[PDB]
From Swiss-Prot:
Impact when changing N409Y: In allele CYP2A6*24
Effect seen on changing F89L: In allele CYP2A6*25 and allele CYP2A6*26
Originating organism: Homo sapiens
Pfam families per UniProt: p450 (PF00067)
Protein name from the UniProt record: Cytochrome P450 2A6
Factors inducing expression: By phenobarbital and dexamethasone.
GO-annotated cellular components: cytoplasm; cytoplasmic microtubule; endoplasmic reticulum membrane; intracellular membrane-bounded organelle
Tissue spec: Liver.
Enzyme class: oxidoreductase
Length: 465
């Protein structure tokens, strides 16, 4: 219609700030959607953004017009350090170049293959030892899980795992959890609107920047070490591979393979390969203790298909529809990245009689699809049946989009699914979950919701079975 999607009239500079609640962006947007429709325009400060709500609107854009919506938008906090470099926040040629290399290199190191499956199984065994080590005490699982998860991707990018005792490793994981939570707080979402000003003011954002610089510094050190010990004929990990390609691209003035893209791309994979799976696992166990009946059914299936002796393997999932449904329901309820990572229209285009000019930022509301009442009967309830038919067999859903969809969807989905199944299964096979409080007093509502969905802090006991 030559006109952008409908939305509330914005004010100079602050945009629609007054009609939004930074502490509850999702609820604020859904409220506006009820008045303007499933597809609308919003102004986060001066950033004009088109919001897509519900399965239909999201799929039509990201898949039906995949190319048109294949551009990458921004996440102001992360942009502070990335500045458009690296695979995640890059665009155009840089994006096509870095993504293609990352996926291939990832495959070269076992992802999607027996190689990484064995890596995950071994790390899962280390988690089991670590959990038995607690002696059934009631502890905070947070870093036990993130250390295990992080060691998988760390093996690939750094060529080796971290010792669970390594204090520098714990420091890194704390940096990641800190940034992740900051982007999900009110100040974090306020930052998304007013970064032009806030990046220069005192406040929590400065601490978040500190944590990003800490992470970047660690990667820079790793790169330098690999540089002065590199064997161009035999790469030890993702970093070496990128370094070799960089050597080959030296006589190319326009190459995308240079130090800054190496540092940022590796940072993307280190953070990306750690925080979301870790958060999903953490939310998952809380959900299971909240619903004892589900844990019991999971135990019945594991003992039947796998038993108590052997280590779970990825091929076991095809014989475990219940576990498969439980994990899917954990990702659906968890809604870890509720508004996905912002996209951007790559070229002027028409969408549902709306005119979207090149460069227009887009917010695919994944959370609104994971809870779309047209695909799930009681979207607000944690219920594995959402992914099972009456015969107890696994039932797929077009609205299951926790990894998003389209041209810039998560290429870490393969690794993540294998980690979620092996870690969830191996932990449940060996332990019974014991909550600190009664199932009735357990609060599963999120602590923060912004860029991500963060579960409340909690402690628990892992009692051997
Ligand atoms: C349960 C875990 C995970 C969730 C929920 C998740 C979610 C997402 C989402 C929603 C996106 C944005 C997609 C889009 O723009 O349309 C994405 C991007 C991405 N994810 Fe993940 N992810 C997970 C795990 C992984 C893992 C394990 C890695 C690391 C190997 C990873 C790396 C990436 C990368 C590199 C991108 C950017 C892709 C691009 O811009 O082309 N993710 N992820
Ligand atoms: C820095 C921050 C992020 S945001 S957390 C995340 C997003 C998508 N997939 C996994 C983790 C991703 C890559 N690099």
């Amino acid at each position: 219609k030559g006109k952008l999607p409908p939305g509330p009239t914005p004010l100079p500079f602050i945009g629609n700030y007054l009609q939004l609640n930074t502490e509850q962006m999702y609820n604020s947007l859904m409220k506006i959607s009820e008045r303007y429709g499933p597809v609308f325009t919003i102004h986060l400060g001066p950033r004009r953004v088109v919001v897509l709500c519900g399965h239909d609107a999201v799929r039509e854009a990201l898949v039906d017009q995949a190319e048109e919506f294949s551009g990458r938008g921004e996440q102001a906090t992360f942009d502070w350090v990335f500045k458009g470099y690296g695979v995640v926040f890059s665009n155009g040629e840089r994006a096509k170049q870095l993504r293609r290399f990352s996926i291939a290199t990832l495959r070269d190191f076992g992802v999607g293959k027996r190689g990484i499956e064995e890596r995950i199984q071994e790390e899962a065994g280390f988690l089991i030892d670590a959990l038995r080590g607690t002696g059934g005490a009631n502890i905070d699982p947070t870093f036990f899980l993130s250390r295990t998860v992080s060691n998988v991707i760390s093996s690939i990018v750094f060529g080796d795992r971290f010792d669970y005792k390594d204090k520098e490793f714990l420091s890194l994981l704390r940096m990641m959890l800190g940034i992740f939570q900051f982007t999900s707080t009110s100040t974090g979402q306020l930052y998304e609107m007013f970064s032009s000003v806030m990046k220069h003011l005192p406040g929590p954002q400065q601490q978040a920047f500190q944590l990003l610089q800490g992470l970047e510094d660690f990667i820079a050190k790793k790169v330098e070490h690999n540089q002065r010990t590199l064997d161009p004929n035999s790469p030890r990990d993702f970093i070496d591979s990128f370094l070799i390609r960089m050597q080959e691209e030296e006589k190319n003035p326009n190459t995308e393979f240079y130090l800054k893209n190496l540092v940022m791309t590796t940072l993307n994979l280190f953070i990306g390969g750690t925080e979301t799976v870790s958060t999903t696992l953490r939310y998952g166990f809380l959900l299971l203790m909240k619903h004892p009946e589900v844990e019991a059914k999971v135990h019945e299936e594991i003992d039947r298909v796998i038993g108590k002796n052997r280590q779970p393997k990825f091929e076991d999932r095809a014989k475990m529809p219940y576990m498969e449904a439980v994990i899917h329901e954990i990702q659906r309820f968890g809604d870890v990245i509720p508004m996905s990572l912002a996209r951007r229209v790559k070229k002027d285009t028409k969408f549902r009689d709306f005119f979207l000019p090149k460069g227009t930022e887009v917010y695919p509301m994944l959370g609104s699809v994971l809870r779309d009442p047209s695909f799930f009967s009681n979207p607000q309830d944690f219920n594995p049946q959402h992914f099972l038919n009456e015969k107890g067999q696994f039932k797929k859903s077009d609205a299951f989009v926790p990894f998003s969809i389209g041209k810039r969807n998560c290429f870490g989905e393969g690794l993540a699914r294998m980690e979620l199944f092996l870690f969830f299964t191996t932990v449940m096979q060996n332990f019974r979950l014991k909550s600190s409080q009664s199932p009735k007093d357990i609060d599963v509502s999120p602590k923060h919701v912004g860029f991500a969905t963060i579960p409340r802090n909690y402690t628990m006991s892992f009692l051997p079975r």
